[PDB]
């Protein structure tokens, strides 16, 4: 199975601007990328990339309608500033299970202002003193986190 | 966690109530072994 097969199954061989969500899960990728998603995409709301072996974020269509994106179980470790230049309209961010070394990796999210929830589970950065407080004062725009900002609501 | 008024109760009753609240874990009979010690036997520990 490949990203192309998932794209064909979800789109069912139709125009790219017909679905506002994608499910790219359990898909092998060339050197850890997210190919199979052409830049021609114009409308997209939800994303899902799990067990894709994504190692970096360097290929992504420019978008202005996406609000949620899901990355998990990946060895990606690099600056995410490119998201601002690609789609500065993210509201739900999920990095659960990813591999991030230190706090500097999550710095480039400051320039994004629409993010309200960020998820980081069993991450090497999560095991630090005052990581919760340090992240909060580092990303003032954030309104939610792993789930315990002040209360518990569901996405 | 099992919220309580604040009364003092025997540990056995507290454990019983806590397992009742999380009944799914208590009624687990098929173990999905994840890791094993070099010498210990998983079956014996699970049965215990």
């Amino acid at each position: 199975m490949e990203m192309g097969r998932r794209i064909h199954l979800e789109l069912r061989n139709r125009t790219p601007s017909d679905v506002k969500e994608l499910v790219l899960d359990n898909s092998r990728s060339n050197e850890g990328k997210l190919e199979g998603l052409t830049d021609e995409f114009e409308e997209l709301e939800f994303l899902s990339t799990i067990n894709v072996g994504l190692t970096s974020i360097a290929n992504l269509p420019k978008l202005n309608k996406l609000k949620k994106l899901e990355l998990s179980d990946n060895r990606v470790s690099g600056g995410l500033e490119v998201l601002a230049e690609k789609c500065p309209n993210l509201t739900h961010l999920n990095l659960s299970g990813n591999k991030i070394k230190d706090l500097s990796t999550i710095e480039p999210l400051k320039k994004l202002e629409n993010l309200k929830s960020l998820d980081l589970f069993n991450c090497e950065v999560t095991n630090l003193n005052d990581y919760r407080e340090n992240v909060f004062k580092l990303l003032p725009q954030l309104t939610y986190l792993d789930g315990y900002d002040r209360d518990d609501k569901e996405a | 966690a099992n919220m309580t008024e604040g009364k003092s109760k025997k540990p056995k009753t507290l454990a019983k109530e806590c397992l009742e609240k999380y009944s799914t874990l208590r009624d687990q009979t098929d173990p999905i072994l994840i890791m094993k010690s070099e010498k210990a036997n998983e079956n014996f520990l699970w049965k215990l």
Partner: protein, 760 residues
Amino acid sequence: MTLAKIELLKQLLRDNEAKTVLKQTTVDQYNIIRKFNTSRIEKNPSLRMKWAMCSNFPLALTKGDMANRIPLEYKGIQLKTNAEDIGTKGQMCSIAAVTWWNTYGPIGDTEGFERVYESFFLRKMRLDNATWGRITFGPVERVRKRVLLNPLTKEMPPDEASNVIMEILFPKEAGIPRESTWIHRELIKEKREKLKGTMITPIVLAYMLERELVARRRFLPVAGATSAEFIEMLHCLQGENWRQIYHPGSRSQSMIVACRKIIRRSIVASNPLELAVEIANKTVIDTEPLKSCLAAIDGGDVACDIIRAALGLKIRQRQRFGRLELKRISGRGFKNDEEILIGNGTIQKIGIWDGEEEFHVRCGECRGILKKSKMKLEKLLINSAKKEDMRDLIILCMVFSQDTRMFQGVRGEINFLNRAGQLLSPMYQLQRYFLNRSNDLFDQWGYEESPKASELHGINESMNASDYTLKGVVVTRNVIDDFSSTETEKVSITKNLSLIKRTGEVIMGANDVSELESQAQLMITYDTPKMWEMGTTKELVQNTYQWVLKNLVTLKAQFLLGKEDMFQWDAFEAFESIIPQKMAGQYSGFARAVLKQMRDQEVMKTDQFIKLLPFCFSPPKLRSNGEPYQFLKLVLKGGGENFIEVRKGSPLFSYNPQTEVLTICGRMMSLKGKIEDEERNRSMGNAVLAGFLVSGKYDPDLGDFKTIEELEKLKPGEKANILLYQGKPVKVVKRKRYSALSNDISQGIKRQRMTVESMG
């Protein structure tokens, strides 16, 4: 070879004797024909083998092309000869060629041994990983017991074992699969897949499977554990004057609980037998009906024995009274009604046994011999096994003996019932009274001097090995071995579940079962609404989801039609009991709207369909305007963890599509995927020639016969010409459904009794 087969057949028929015998003896009679061998068995195998090993070519090689791999003489050593043979019609050879083959020659495949000889390698694994301990040189007390020599993958009776073996490794000759392949479908498919890819002779595999399935049991002297794993090593573990510590490298409690629940459910109603058997054969334990472990173990708890009697199975004919297992030794007791005053002052009319009698008595781990006369216990010999078991044995034998002292020792009252609320006979009422208050007849029974002797030593009322014992009771420091001649004699079953001998005598009563509740260590999934309206909400949800899952094909087919008849199913009525009354209607309306949307504007999604279907049993209550209410969290009775998540999953229900698995009430089940493709993968076991019924005779209109692979090509409802068993041409029709004879019989009985009651 088939041409060689036909040529050999023609040559054999050329003689008139072959023609007359072949055309005379039917296929069934073939067995007799085979047994007419010379039987000139060697008188002394040792001498024969010794002589043969010194002969030039004792080995009898089968004619073939293998010999060309090896010369008739290698390195100046004679190996094989080209002289003809009369005994086997092959060639002759010597062990020299065998050793050379072990040295050089063709190299075979090593895969087959990984799985084919699974039992032997499992034995080796259990030996290697076992942990040894100290050795206790002191004397060891051993009891003679009927033990299973070797562990079994799935114990089954010999006939079922043979049928399963044939269904596994003999795809042909599989006419009309019985009511045994569906029970063992998982074993069938597992062994079929494992043994595929081999080239060993089929008879070897058949014998190995027979060893792996058919049970082997024997009388052995054992002390301690008794599972087959320990019996394998009994030769090293045990010892007349030495013992070793050994730890080799469940369903029972669940079946006990299920049988007890079935007994309690059926007794309260009239005609308990039919209802009990319906529930028993409609029950399942995680992969199989109850006739998969009941038929495995020998005997068991009284409830299991009664259920087996209700079903078709063999039960040990020991007399169960409360917990006592009694085996008569001699004497005949005349059961005559008599009026006896009880110690409480009341007078009861009950049956008493005139005449002397003796019984071997067992209870848990306690064995003994009891000798009783009418209205009196005479003698009791026991071994020290356990305080609880010894007390139970003493009290139960006391009550059974109907000793006048036991009656005069009553002090309270006897008006008890069972969990079903029924008044029992005075004997069982007294049993319960004395067991509840053990220190009632013990105090006034009277004491007897200690058994002054080399080994015979007494026991006091407290069960401690203390002298000044009870009148009659004696504890011998020896081993009492009892319960011989387990004839499994013919036993009848009355409607009220109480068994009786070939004569009118009663062996097991409906009330022998003890009213003790436990927790099923496994998923006890029934198939009848009547049963599961007892337990907790989690059990109800699990059973409803299992009912939905089992008959997924029918529900999925009815979904396409789009009619409300699909939702008005009795299976969900019990579910209605665990949904809040004030809000169940809103759930039903919301789920109905969601499922209509699913049918209209999207495609199949099994997980959400299963999740949302059951809540629609109750009538809907739409919004004032008319639109359905919307929810995302269905609350259930008990609150807290008893709640369903509409979106992805919850404690009671969570389906993961990455691996396509289903977790219900903390239990993982394999939904390979969706689609009739996954339906057929579920049907990947079953049995060869299971989708075809028999109808008509040869009917040569179809010409020659067709194989199973070509049989599948035919569309449902066609007619095909096939061979049944060893020949027997017949005409068959491909089935359009899956059948269950037990369900049909149960429904017929239900209709019959409904008619009887309506006329009455």
